[PDB]
Amino acid sequence: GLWEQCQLLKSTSVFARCHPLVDPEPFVALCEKTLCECAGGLECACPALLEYARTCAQEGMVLYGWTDHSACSPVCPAGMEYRQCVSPCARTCQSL
Amino acid sequence: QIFSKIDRPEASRIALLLMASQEPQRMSRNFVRYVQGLKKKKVIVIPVGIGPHANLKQIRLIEKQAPENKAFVLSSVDELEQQRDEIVSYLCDLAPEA
């Protein structure tokens, strides 16, 4: 009942944008492997989706929807939120 | 309704079908009849499947009617701009000069 979560890489529009650049087949295979290995729920899929999205970003196509077209949210520090395409030279209270 | 009668016999006429979603089965049952009628009314139909949810079946059923109906299938709208030149050149190659 979790295998469909890996097929998001093939079925779901935000991931499907990147098929000309990154082949989903290895990442969905690895996803099915983590679904075999992992004892949790649907979150057991998420590392393969995250690494596919990061591979697409490295190939120059950011997957802005991926973390809400899916149940997968990466871990973040308290009061922060995960997002794609955070800028370098991040502004702070102390920085010119 | 569009080609209710041909008013330009000299021209080529083409339906560029930008399509991104599946029909439910109960609606699909006349699709082959309409596309073959469009061929009989000398209309070219060019299917452009966009994203995972375009039903490839109807793309290929359009292609099966004539080789002029050459399909496009795309991972997202973002590469439509990347298809633009081959699409518009193919459209013009499939049309006669004055």
As a whole number of angstroms, the distance between CA B12 and CA B43 comes to 8
DSSP track, A26-82: HHHHHHHHHHHH--SSGGGGHHHHHHHHHHHHHTT---TTTTTSSS------TT---
On whether the CB atoms of residues B43 and B13 are closer than 8 A, the answer is yes
Pick among B53, B76, B79 to test the A interface (most A CBs inside 10 A): B76
3-class DSSP state for residue B50?
strand
* Residue B44 CB contacts under 8 Å (≥ 6 apart), including other chains: B12, B13, B14, B15, B66, B68, B69, B94
Across the strands, what pairs with B72? B48
Q: Which chain A residues are closer than 8 Å to B81 by Cβ? A: none
Q: Which chain B residues are closer than 8 Å to A18 by Cβ? A: 75
Q: Where does chain B break, by residue before each gap (C–N > 2.5 Å)?
A: none
On whether the CB atoms of residues B18 and B50 are closer than 8 A, the answer is yes
- Contacts of range B61-65, beta carbons closer than 8 Å, 24 or more positions apart: B61/B31, B61/B32, B61/B35, B62/B17, B62/B35, B65/B35, B65/B36, B65/B38, B65/B39
Q: Which residues of B25-51 are buried (b: 16+ CB within 10 A; e: fewer)?
A: eeeeeeeeeebeebbeeebbbbbbbbb
Residue of B76, B82, B4, B71 lying closest to B44 (CA atoms): B71
Phi-psi bin for B95: left (phi > 0), alpha (psi -120 to 50), beta? Answer: beta
B79 and chain A in contact, CB less than 8 A: yes
Cα A71 to Cα A68, A75, B38, B73: the distances in Å are 6, 13, 44, 28
On whether the CB atoms of residues A54 and A47 are closer than 8 A, the answer is no
As a whole number of angstroms, the distance between CA B5 and CA A63 comes to 46
* Residue A96 CB contacts under 8 Å (≥ 6 apart), including other chains: none
Q: Which chain A residues are closer than 8 Å to B52 by Cβ? A: 10-13, 16
- Looking up tokens 């209270």 gives A93
Q: In Å, what resolution does this model reach?
A: 3.1
**Environment class of residue A41 by beta-carbon count within 10 Å: exposed (0-12), middle (13-18) or buried (19+)?**
exposed
Q: Across the interface, do B78 and A17 touch by the CB < 8 Å criterion?
A: yes
